[PDB]
Design a protein around this ligand. Structure first.
Ligand code: BEF
Ligand SMILES: [Mg+2]
Ligand SMILES: [Mg+2]
Ligand code: NA
Length: 994
């Protein structure tokens, strides 16, 4: 049924042709069912195939390396008939690496999914219909409910479908709609058409929305829509139709992955282009190949050389590591790149109710009368700590602790609160939390009484289950509740008639205990209580009470206030008639004013600090709430989004106001404004979209189904653990404990993760630049190999790979949470950092060659050949005239090679230290700053001397121990890489940004 809300009860019955009295017929059911389907959602798209392992392979860095792993295989297979099948173990181990890395990826994806999933209860949910089968009610499963049928709901029921209320059986029906609309206080429903054409869900006061619950009352309705067509369904689709780019980190990597893809392609050319016209008289005939087409093959062999084999693993090790650090602070992260997103966020958008707030009505102030001396009236005002329904907290007066029991006025106040109450408390053993039973604004009082513990009852040993209503039980023992005078919109109050229970200390007073809107109640008071005594309601008293009430109702604390009284001398039960609520106002008169209670849906305690921390880190916070504007701002003020008496002129907008703006101005308003109230789920998203249109990286934080689309839209959606199931599946982060300060932590985490990466990318890559420059110098000068393909595979993956990993523990600067968020366009590697590590890669290249060469020509351990012999060693023959005294085998000596490897390592172990700080001298931050680095350094060297001295290794790696003076040379060559880098760091602090 379309817009049942705009119709009438009759128009709606008519439309389906049904009886409010009997309900649908099984034939009507049968049809209605086949026409509309089962009131439910489609099977969650939550089943990712193992071919989503092919999503772990969308990273240009793995793609790149997979090409270099298949270009190696296609350039390794059959390329020399005389090949021993043990040179293929590069592409093979590249496989086993990527296979693994692409898997530890999918591990966290489901490791996350079923942690988040662990947070849901129950198995099924159900409803209550009247069909023409039985004259009575029927507990039917929620799915089997169809449009058209007659449902009944009572306090505590979750509304099964979207329903058009037909008849309110209780005097008054209240609905908790916070999961859907963000509304702080349950909403009073009526049964009349909502004509309004611009009318929104929070205006459909004659409708009951699936997902929502009953705070009070009982009602009969007719199902308007079901499954996907509910307000719950619509938003579900809306959320799934929202598209998403890749994380900003993944984007930065793919941006880099393509910069690398360019240089690799630039080299394959450069070298090939430089030689094709020089292949003539090759002499290749025996070799059976076409050349300047085989020269190509060596060009790509250089390409593959430029790829840091070990990179995608260290990255995926850095992240996974940071994910696990967040999980100890109780943050489930769905995907690895997501642990960064927050580190570079410019704006955090945040929902209010249940996000910034607990959505648990709390009494935090209360007063009674202290003294009445003629024109003088003093009050006893108290405060209560606590922010949830949990009976945990203390009562203060003047900010220090009291026993409520010590004030008889507090004893009565407690008593009214216990007795004049249709609700209770309950501990949910499964979720491990206390929860309201009934109406939020009533349970606030239940909780308050438990905290107050007015009789000093021992409660220590009680299960949280038994403790929930303990103190209230004790009070309910003093007086039998004989009946209740239900609320009514005319007087806005209620009361209970109570006879004393045990004939002990009972003055026969059949008291009535009363509560309601303050001045309604106060105007019917003649006396006021002062301890156990009573006195006339003088005028200055009435002025004193009311002045404080107006205070509490406004400004700094914008509390919902409630006046409490008793009729000391109630009528007799006989002379009082109940079937007419219009009598009630009169029964509640001649009253004794007792006290007042102030309550609100309070901010979560961490929030305010968190919001300041963010601000100190250059991040805006914006509130987007479906709740009303007044409560929205009040809350913005308490938490610091706005200040004490700051003007929020054009800085706060409702949904209507915003929608009235022209699109150009809407986008503009999202730039200045920080409070949007009364918004639809759609707005929440549109606003994020608007912020993203300033190239701004934004987060979203929420709990209810109305945050879902906005949560899917943000670069990160953060969901509260106690939030709806939709909000969680749309988010990428989930605060299991609702601790808003994790956000401030998950962020500074994600700034450290970027810096470490950026750091160990500069380190690993200069390696492959050195390794490449060396293989190129060797071919251009015509010297023997200084380093072989395998010696490098090991260096890259292991020797280098560990110190790279232990860069992920570089102590984060303290200035880190002082700087703004990095600029969106600013790339990972700049044209300076490039030159910078290419100068390292440069030197490294030269040095390793120098090493092997210095041995051939000057080392006292190895015959000092001339540059000419070394350059023409291929022409060496059995005692050639030009190679006098030499053994041609000497050009394969393991000494120049051991000499060349050691220089690499010792420069990489050396340059690892240089990789401690982008610009801070090794003087400032010393070698010993990072300890987990020095651990790697020594383990690397340890595994070096291992390969040299461990029998089987020297042969398989083609190496031989180095003597002292030799190592003495290895160092002389490697140290200056420091002095070199040191010279670069100076350049980039005293001359550039200076
Ligand atoms: F519940 Be939110 F504030 F919309
Ligand atoms: Mg390689
Ligand atoms: Mg909310
Ligand atoms: Na998201």
């Amino acid at each position: 049924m379309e817009a049942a809300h705009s119709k009438s009860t009759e128009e709606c019955l008519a439309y389906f042709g049904v009886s409010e009295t009997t309900g649908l017929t099984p034939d009507q059911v049968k049809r209605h069912l086949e026409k509309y389907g089962h009131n439910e959602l489609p099977a969650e798209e939550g089943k990712s195939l193992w071919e989503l392992v092919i999503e772990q392979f969308e990273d240009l860095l793995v793609r790149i390396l997979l090409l270099a792993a298949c270009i190696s295989f296609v350039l390794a297979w059959f390329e020399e008939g005389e090949e021993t099948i043990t040179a293929f173990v590069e592409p093979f181990v590249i496989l086993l690496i990527l296979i693994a890395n692409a898997i530890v990826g999918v591990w966290q994806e489901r490791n996350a999914e079923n942690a988040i999933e662990a947070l849901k209860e129950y198995e099924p949910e159900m409803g209550k219909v009247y069909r023409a089968d039985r004259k009575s009610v029927q507990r039917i499963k929620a799915r089997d409910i169809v449009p058209g049928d007659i449902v009944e709901v009572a306090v505590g029921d979750k509304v099964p479908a979207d329903i058009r209320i037909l008849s309110i059986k209780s005097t008054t029906l209240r609905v908790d709609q916070s999961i859907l609309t963000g509304e702080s206080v349950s909403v009073i429903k009526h049964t009349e058409p909502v004509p309004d054409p611009r009318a929104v869900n929070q205006d459909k006061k004659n409708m009951l929305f699936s997902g929502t619950n009953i705070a009070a009352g009982k009602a009969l309705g007719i199902v308007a829509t079901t499954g996907v067509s509910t307000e719950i369904g619509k938003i579900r689709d809306q959320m799934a139709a929202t598209e998403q780019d890749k994380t900003p980190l993944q984007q930065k990597l793919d941006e880099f992955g393509e910069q690398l893809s360019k240089v690799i392609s630039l080299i394959c050319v450069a070298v090939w282009l430089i030689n094709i016209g020089h292949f003539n008289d090759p002499v290749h005939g025996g070799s059976w190949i076409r050349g300047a087409i085989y020269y190509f093959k060596i060009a790509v062999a250089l390409a593959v050389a430029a790829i840091p084999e070990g990179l995608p693993a260290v990255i995926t090790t850095c992240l996974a590591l940071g994910t696990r650090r967040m999980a100890k602070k109780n943050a489930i992260v769905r995907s690895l790149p997501s642990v960064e997103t927050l580190g570079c966020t410019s704006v955090i958008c945040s929902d209010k109710t249940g996000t910034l707030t607990t959505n648990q009505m709390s009494v935090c102030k209360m007063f009674i009368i202290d003294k009445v001396d003629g024109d003088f009236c003093s009050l006893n005002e108290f405060s209560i700590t606590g922010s949830t329904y949990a009976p945990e907290g203390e009562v203060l007066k003047n900010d220090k602790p009291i026993r409520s029991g010590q004030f008889d006025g507090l004893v009565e106040l407690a008593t009214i609160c216990a007795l004049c109450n249709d609700s209770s408390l309950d501990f949910n053993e499964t979720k491990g939390v206390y929860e309201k039973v009934g109406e939020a604004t009533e349970t606030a009082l239940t909780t308050l009484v438990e905290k107050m513990n007015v009789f000093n009852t021992e409660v220590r040993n009680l299960s949280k289950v038994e403790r929930a209503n303990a103190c209230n039980s004790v009070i309910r023992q003093l007086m039998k509740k004989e009946f209740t005078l239900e609320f009514s919109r005319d007087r806005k109050s209620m009361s209970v008639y109570c006879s004393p229970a045990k004939s002990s200390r009972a003055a026969v007073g059949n008291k009535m205990f009363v509560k309601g809107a303050p001045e309604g109640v106060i105007d019917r008071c003649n006396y006021v209580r002062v301890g156990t005594t009573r006195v006339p309601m003088t005028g200055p008293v009435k002025e004193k009470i009311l002045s404080v009430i107006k205070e509490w109702g406004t400004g700094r604390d914008t509390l919902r206030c409630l006046a409490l009284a008793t009729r000391d001398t109630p009528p007799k039960r006989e002379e009082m008639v109940l079937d007419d609520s219009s009598r009630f106002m009169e029964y509640e008169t001649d009253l004794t004013f007792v006290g007042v209670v102030g309550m609100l849906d309070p901010p979560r305690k961490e929030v305010m600090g968190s919001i300041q921390l963010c601000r100190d880190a250059g991040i805006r916070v914006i509130m987007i709430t479906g709740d009303n504007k007044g409560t929205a701002i009040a809350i913005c003020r308490r938490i610091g989004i706005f200040g004490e008496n700051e003007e929020v002129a054009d800085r706060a907008y409702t949904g209507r106001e915003f929608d009235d703006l022209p699109l150009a101005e809407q986008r503009e308003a999202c730039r200045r404004a920080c409070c949007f109230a009364r918004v639809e789920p759609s707005h929440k998203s549109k606003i994020v979209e608007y912020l993203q249109s300033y190239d701004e990286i934004t987060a979203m934080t929420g709990d209810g189904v109305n945050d879902a689309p906005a949560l899917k839209k943000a670069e990160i959606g953060i969901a509260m653990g106690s939030g709806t199931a939709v909000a969680k599946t749309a988010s990428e982060m989930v605060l299991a404990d609702d601790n808003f300060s994790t956000i401030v932590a998950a962020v500074e985490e994600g700034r450290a993760i970027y810096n470490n990466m950026k750091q160990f990318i500069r380190y690993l890559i200069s390696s492959n630049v050195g390794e490449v420059v060396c293989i190129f110098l060797t071919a251009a000068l015509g010297l023997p190999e200084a380093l072989i393909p395998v010696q490098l595979l090991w260096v890259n993956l292991v020797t280098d790979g560990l110190p790279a990993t232990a860069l992920g523990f570089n102590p984060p600067d303290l200035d880190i949470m002082d700087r703004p968020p990095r600029s969106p366009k600013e790339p990972l590697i700049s044209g300076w950092l490039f030159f910078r590590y290419m100068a390292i890669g440069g030197y490294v290249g030269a040095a390793t060659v120098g090493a092997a060469a210095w041995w051939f020509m000057y080392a006292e351990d190895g015959p000092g050949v001339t540059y000419h012999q070394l350059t023409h060693f291929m022409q060496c023959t059995e005692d050639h005239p030009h190679f006098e005294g030499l053994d041609c085998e000497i050009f394969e000596a393991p000494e120049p090679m051991t000499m060349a490897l050691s220089v690499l390592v010792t420069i990489e172990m050396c340059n690892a230290l240089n990789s401690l700080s982008e610009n801070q001298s090794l003087m400032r931050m010393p070698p010993w700053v990072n300890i987990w680095l020095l651990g790697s350094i020594c383990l690397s060297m340890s595994l070096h001397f291992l390969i040299l001295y461990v029998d089987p290794l020297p042969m398989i790696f083609k190496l031989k121990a180095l003597d002292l003076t030799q190592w003495l040379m290895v160092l002389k060559i490697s140290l200056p890489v420091i002095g070199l880098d040191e010279i670069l760091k100076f350049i980039a602090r005293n001359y550039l940004e200076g």
